[PDB]
Design a protein around this ligand. Structure first.
Ligand SMILES: CO[C@@H]1O[C@@H]2CO[C@](C)(C(=O)O)O[C@H]2[C@H](O)[C@@H]1NC(C)=O
Length: 163
């Protein structure tokens, strides 16, 4: 019965979340960005931020971009990668679908995708979305093809942290 905001507040006490500068609004109903998901992965899984390195050519991907040390850490692990692998564009403000987040979290948690799963996800992601639902990361009624909200990543992170 813990509310999503209560889960956010617990995770903020734990250092996994921090919210936005200068405001207490967690913006739980907005879509999470790729940069924000990289940060949460680093904190959840005990990865080390990598400073001073820039693998991507996106505009404003530089030392003034708060998310670069997190993005570099998850990139070096193979947990995330460029949206355009040839042009080296990460798309840091881009969105992330439920099924994409499922793949990444299941991998990071060392969970195994379910073979021969039947669900609404894209074919390549069905096993991962099923594993994520079975592990309590996302609701069985989540739309795997929709962009994941910050709320959903709070719920997922809270569940992953408890594991
Ligand atoms: C713009 O500042 C960032 O905001 C990010 C929002 O999303 C998450 C995942 C969060 O912890 O809520 O990450 C935040 C970044 O850490 C950063 N916030 C701060 C306070 O520096």
């Amino acid at each position: 019965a813990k509310t999503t905001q209560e889960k956010f507040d617990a995770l903020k006490e734990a250092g996994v979340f921090s919210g936005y500068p200068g405001t207490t609004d967690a913006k739980l109903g907005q879509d999470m960005t790729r940069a924000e998901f990289a940060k949460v992965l680093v904190k959840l899984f005990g990865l080390k931020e990598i400073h001073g390195q820039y693998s991507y050519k996106d505009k404003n991907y530089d030392a003034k971009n708060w998310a670069a040390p997190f993005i570099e850490a998850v990139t070096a692990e193979g947990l995330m990668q460029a949206k355009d692998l040839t042009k080296k564009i990460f798309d840091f403000n881009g969105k992330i679908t439920v099924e994409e987040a499922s793949k990444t979290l299941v991998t990071a948690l060392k969970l195994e995708p379910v073979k021969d799963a039947q669900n609404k996800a894209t074919d390549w992601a069905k096993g991962y979305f099923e594993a994520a639902v079975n592990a309590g990361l996302f609701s069985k009624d989540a739309n795997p093809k929709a962009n994941a909200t910050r709320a959903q990543l709070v719920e997922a992170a809270f569940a992953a942290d408890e594991m």
